[PDB]
Structure formats: C-alpha cells, structure tokens
Amino acid sequence: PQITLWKRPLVTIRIGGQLKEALLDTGADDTVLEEMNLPGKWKPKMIGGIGGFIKVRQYDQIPIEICGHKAIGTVLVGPTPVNIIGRNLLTQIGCTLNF
Amino acid sequence: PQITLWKRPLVTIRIGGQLKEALLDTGADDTVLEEMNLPGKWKPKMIGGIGGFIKVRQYDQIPIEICGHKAIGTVLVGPTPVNIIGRNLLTQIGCTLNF
Ligand SMILES: CC[C@H](C)CN(C[C@@H](O)[C@H](Cc1ccccc1)NC(=O)c1cccc(O)c1)S(=O)(=O)c1ccc(-c2ccno2)s1
C-alpha cells in the first residue's frame, strides 16, 4: 500500500500466531517489541533512543508478517514505549519513503 | 525522490542560517531538533521514547526547508542525539511510505 502520515502509520503484524499493532518507524534501526514471550535462544543487547539506553533481548530469524508481507529477521524485545517496526524489516518488505 | 531504508534516511534541512542533517522519521509525531537558540515564543514539553523522556522547547510556525520543499510548523528543540523530521512536516513535503 501507500501510507500517508497525517495519522500514525500503525499496522497489524502477525508473530508467533499472535496479532499485534506496530508502528512503521523509519527512524528506528531495529524492530523493537514490548515485553512478550518468544521461543529459542536470545542474546542480551543494549540499544539507545531519545531518552538513553535500555536492555533488550535479541531474537534472530523471527518471522513477522507485516500488512501481509513476510519478513524473517531480528526482533528486539524490551521496554519500548510502543511496538516499532524498524529499518531491518522495513527493507525486507520493500518499504520506501517517497516525496 | 524515492528513499530506500538500507541506511538511515538522512536528508539536508535548512532552518534559517543553519543547514543540518535530519532523519525522515515516520515514528516521530513531531519534529525534534538538536539544541539551538531559535527566536520567538515557546513552551516546555516532555517527550518520551526509547530510554525515557527528554525535555524540549516547542516552537510553532517555524519554516524549515527539506530538500528544497517548503514546510512550516511545530519544532521541538532539545537534547536529542539526532535531528528528526516528524510527521507534522513530512506530510507538508508530500512524503509517504510505500511497499
Ligand atoms: C515512541 C516511538 C518512537 C520510539 C519515537 N521516537 C522516534 C524513533 O524513530 C527514534 C528516533 C531516534 C533515532 C536515533 C536516536 C534517537 C531517536 N528511534 C529510536 O528510538 C531508535 C533509533 C535507533 C535504533 C533503535 O532501536 C531505536 S522518538 O525519537 O523518541 C520521538 C520523536 C518525536 C517524538 C514526539 C513525541 C511527541 N511529539 O513528538 S518521540
């Protein structure tokens, strides 16, 4: 689709058979989801945003379907204010900015 | 233009006599610029992201040129690590997300 920006670009994602709302976030390098359970081995990681650094759990090669487009990649789980889809997965689904 | 998201979507913006690199950021409701002493009235605000909150000064009806496109609107000025063009100005320059 084409998505305009008068509203937050929130989309439904499917991950582990669960439906969540996430923000398409071109200013985020990474995809960061609020606390949830994901299976498999994870690595402790730290990431930085506008307010400083937080600790997250890094899961690799997690499938997410974003608006019906399939991605498989790195998902960080931790205290983000909202679920965000970052550039690592935006590139996989062919998302671009256009003006 | 079309901007892919393999790298950060940094573009040149102009604010008065200052040229800066800023993120085209669909995850940002409003534009946030690095500390700078802009003329005119403003109001303090707290904005939250990854890591917590920062305090900013909200200026309204500030003209910003973004890749030659004219915009005018709210700009939040504070101790952000990166200049951020938010949805409030992205819409004005005709920026959409596409996939
Ligand atoms: C709540 C949703 C967002 C977290 C809001 N922010 C916009 C993000 O795109 C942010 C941009 C960023 C990039 C690099 C360093 C610091 C920040 N990215 C990130 O936080 C980021 C950057 C790099 C890697 C990563 O894993 C995350 S944000 O930066 O916190 C933000 C912008 C405008 C906001 C607002 C609130 C009310 N009115 O306006 S809140």
TrEMBL record, chains A, B:
<feature type="domain" description="Peptidase A2">
    <location>
        <begin position="20"/>
        <end position="89"/>
    </location>
</feature>
<keyword id="KW-0645">Protease</keyword>
<keyword id="KW-0064">Aspartyl protease</keyword>
<dbReference type="GO" id="GO:0006508">
    <property type="term" value="P:proteolysis"/>
</dbReference>
<dbReference type="InterPro" id="IPR021109">
    <property type="entry name" value="Peptidase_aspartic_dom_sf"/>
</dbReference>
<dbReference type="InterPro" id="IPR034170">
    <property type="entry name" value="Retropepsin-like_cat_dom"/>
</dbReference>
<protein>
    <submittedName>
        <fullName>Protease</fullName>
    </submittedName>
</protein>
<dbReference type="InterPro" id="IPR001995">
    <property type="entry name" value="Peptidase_A2_cat"/>
</dbReference>
<dbReference type="GO" id="GO:0004190">
    <property type="term" value="F:aspartic-type endopeptidase activity"/>
</dbReference>
<keyword id="KW-1039">Host endosome</keyword>
<dbReference type="InterPro" id="IPR018061">
    <property type="entry name" value="Retropepsins"/>
</dbReference>
<dbReference type="GO" id="GO:0055036">
    <property type="term" value="C:virion membrane"/>
</dbReference>
<keyword id="KW-0378">Hydrolase</keyword>
<dbReference type="Pfam" id="PF00077">
    <property type="entry name" value="RVP"/>
</dbReference>
<dbReference type="InterPro" id="IPR001969">
    <property type="entry name" value="Aspartic_peptidase_AS"/>
</dbReference>
<dbReference type="GO" id="GO:0072494">
    <property type="term" value="C:host multivesicular body"/>
</dbReference>
